[PDB]
Design an enzyme around this catalytic site. Structure first.
Site, PDB file in Angstrom:
ATOM      1  N   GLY A 166       0.690  -1.309   0.070  1.00 27.10           N
ATOM      2  CA  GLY A 166       0.140   0.107  -0.004  1.00 27.10           C
ATOM      3  C   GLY A 166       0.793   1.374   0.015  1.00 27.10           C
ATOM      4  O   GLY A 166       2.008   1.253  -0.193  1.00 27.10           O
ATOM      5  N   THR A 167       0.227   2.308   0.462  1.00 21.62           N
ATOM      6  CA  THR A 167       0.639   3.786   0.203  1.00 21.62           C
ATOM      7  C   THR A 167       0.770   4.298   1.969  1.00 21.62           C
ATOM      8  O   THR A 167      -0.471   4.314   2.494  1.00 21.62           O
ATOM      9  CB  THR A 167      -0.084   4.663  -0.604  1.00 21.62           C
ATOM     10  OG1 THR A 167      -0.067   4.152  -1.836  1.00 21.62           O
ATOM     11  CG2 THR A 167       0.802   5.926  -0.705  1.00 21.62           C
TER      12      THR A 167
ATOM     13  N   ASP B 151       6.906 -11.294   9.581  1.00 23.23           N
ATOM     14  CA  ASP B 151       7.339 -10.589   8.625  1.00 23.23           C
ATOM     15  C   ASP B 151       8.244  -9.262   9.288  1.00 23.23           C
ATOM     16  O   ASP B 151       8.403  -8.262   8.955  1.00 23.23           O
ATOM     17  CB  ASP B 151       6.285  -9.617   7.798  1.00 23.23           C
ATOM     18  CG  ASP B 151       6.766  -8.916   6.521  1.00 23.23           C
ATOM     19  OD1 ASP B 151       7.943  -9.476   5.892  1.00 23.23           O
ATOM     20  OD2 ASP B 151       6.343  -8.316   5.856  1.00 23.23           O
TER      21      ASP B 151
ATOM     22  N   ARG C  53      13.036  -3.269   6.901  1.00 21.18           N
ATOM     23  CA  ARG C  53      11.849  -2.177   6.417  1.00 21.18           C
ATOM     24  C   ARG C  53      10.685  -2.291   7.460  1.00 21.18           C
ATOM     25  O   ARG C  53      10.154  -1.013   7.286  1.00 21.18           O
ATOM     26  CB  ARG C  53      11.294  -2.735   5.185  1.00 21.18           C
ATOM     27  CG  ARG C  53      10.285  -4.136   5.158  1.00 21.18           C
ATOM     28  CD  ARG C  53      10.089  -4.710   3.726  1.00 21.18           C
ATOM     29  NE  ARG C  53       9.698  -5.987   4.097  1.00 21.18           N
ATOM     30  CZ  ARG C  53      10.134  -7.100   3.848  1.00 21.18           C
ATOM     31  NH1 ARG C  53      11.506  -7.229   3.405  1.00 21.18           N
ATOM     32  NH2 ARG C  53       9.804  -8.391   4.063  1.00 21.18           N
ATOM     33  N   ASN C  54      10.570  -3.295   8.347  1.00 17.45           N
ATOM     34  CA  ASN C  54       9.539  -2.971   9.411  1.00 17.45           C
ATOM     35  C   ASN C  54       9.883  -2.559  10.897  1.00 17.45           C
ATOM     36  O   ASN C  54       9.101  -3.066  11.682  1.00 17.45           O
ATOM     37  CB  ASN C  54       8.675  -4.461   9.280  1.00 17.45           C
ATOM     38  CG  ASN C  54       7.801  -4.630   8.189  1.00 17.45           C
ATOM     39  OD1 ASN C  54       7.743  -6.033   7.574  1.00 17.45           O
ATOM     40  ND2 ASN C  54       7.410  -3.734   7.489  1.00 17.45           N
TER      41      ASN C  54
ATOM     42  N   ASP D 213       4.077  -3.229  11.758  1.00 14.24           N
ATOM     43  CA  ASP D 213       3.411  -4.499  10.835  1.00 14.24           C
ATOM     44  C   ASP D 213       2.889  -5.788  11.640  1.00 14.24           C
ATOM     45  O   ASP D 213       3.058  -6.758  10.661  1.00 14.24           O
ATOM     46  CB  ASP D 213       4.083  -4.621   9.463  1.00 14.24           C
ATOM     47  CG  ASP D 213       4.017  -3.224   8.614  1.00 14.24           C
ATOM     48  OD1 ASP D 213       3.489  -2.037   9.085  1.00 14.24           O
ATOM     49  OD2 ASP D 213       4.550  -3.297   7.557  1.00 14.24           O
TER      50      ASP D 213
END
Ligand SMILES: *CCC(=O)N1Cc2nc(-c3cccc(Oc4nc(F)ccc4Cl)c3)n(-c3ccncn3)c2C1
Length: 285
Positions: free
Chosen positions: A22-23, A138, A142-143, A156
């Site tokens: 998503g954004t 996950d 990046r998370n 997330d």
């Protein structure tokens, strides 16, 4: 616990970035009762991504908001959700973005004290999720978001369940699956435990030690399980002493129960962060 937001309560102002799922936007939020403007980050998930009805999404969202009780400073807080044609997740604005981009952009300015301290914070956050009996699925650089250079948080959690990755009928995830961060038992049998999270934690640590390098760069995802079976692992980063590398190498064990626990990882990396230059060799320290 879980705030259901009306589109009238918040305004998306600028685009921060667009991932695969998503954004994310930099926004402003004025709660129902309140007369103040809280600066938030809004993640608008890609439409028609979740195989769940709006009631089951809200059930998952409540379980995501429930992680803030009693909470942990190194795990993000889900402030609220807004259900339109898309799922909109709202959280406090982290100005530095994620640790993946942070370590890439600040590569020549990051010392051993920072890297080792980030390893403690991520393990502190993950250990809290383990306490809450929650498997992230996950964990990656990046998370992990950067509130301040000395305060990182895990985002997330519960998103994979929300997007229907814990179903026997819904597995319509082609090239989106994070094979280069997954434990062998997850690639082969879709088994996800706290010990598979330790595997991803080791990869996350390697991403930090390499200043944002892509794991198994060039090797196709279809070949990763075979690489792992042959005994191939991510290389030892140039800054790492063998003491630091052995911790990562242990997260990547074939026997899940033999891998280090997040509790033990907090202690080892805390011992290391007391004499940082002994464990990480970085130019200009
Ligand atoms: C490297 C990628 C990157 O820079 N970012 C990934 C990302 N996600 C989020 C984010 C924003 C709003 C909601 C959100 O989702 C959740 N938040 C929780 F608190 C709990 C569960 C979920 Cl699923 C994730 N951001 C972001 C950017 C700026 N400030 C905060 N978060 C980023 C940045």
């Amino acid at each position: 616990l879980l705030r259901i937001l009306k589109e009238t309560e918040f305004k998306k102002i600028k685009v921060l970035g667009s991932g695969a799922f998503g954004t994310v936007y930099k926004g402003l939020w004025i709660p129902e009762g309140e007369k103040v403007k809280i600066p938030v980050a809004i993640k608008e998930l890609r439409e028609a991504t979740s195989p769940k009805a709006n009631k089951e999404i809200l059930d998952e969202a409540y379980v995501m908001a429930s992680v803030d009780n009693p909470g942990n400073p190194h795990v993000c807080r889900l402030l609220g959700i807004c259900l339109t044609s898309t799922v909109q997740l709202i959280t406090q604005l982290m100005p530095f973005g994620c640790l993946l981009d942070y370590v890439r952009e600040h590569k020549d300015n990051i010392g051993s004290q920072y890297l080792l301290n980030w390893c403690v914070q991520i393990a502190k956050g993950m250990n809290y999720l383990e306490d809450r009996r929650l498997v992230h699925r996950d964990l990656a650089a990046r998370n992990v978001l950067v509130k301040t250079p000395q305060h990182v948080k895990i985002t997330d959690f519960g998103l994979a369940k929300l997007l229907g990755a814990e179903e026997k009928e819904y597995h319509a995830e082609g090239g989106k699956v994070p094979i280069k961060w997954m434990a062998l038992e997850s690639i082969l049998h879709r088994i996800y435990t706290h010990q598979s999270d330790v595997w991803s934690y080791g990869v996350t640590v390697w991403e930090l030690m390499t200043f944002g390098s892509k794991p198994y760069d060039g090797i196709p995802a279809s070949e990763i399980s075979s690489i792992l079976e042959k005994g191939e692992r991510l290389p030892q980063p140039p800054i790492c002493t063998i003491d630091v590398y052995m911790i990562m190498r242990k997260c990547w064990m074939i026997d899940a129960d033999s891998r280090p626990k997040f509790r033990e990882l907090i202690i080892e990396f805390s011992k290391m962060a007391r004499d940082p230059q002994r464990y990480l060799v970085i130019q200009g320290d």
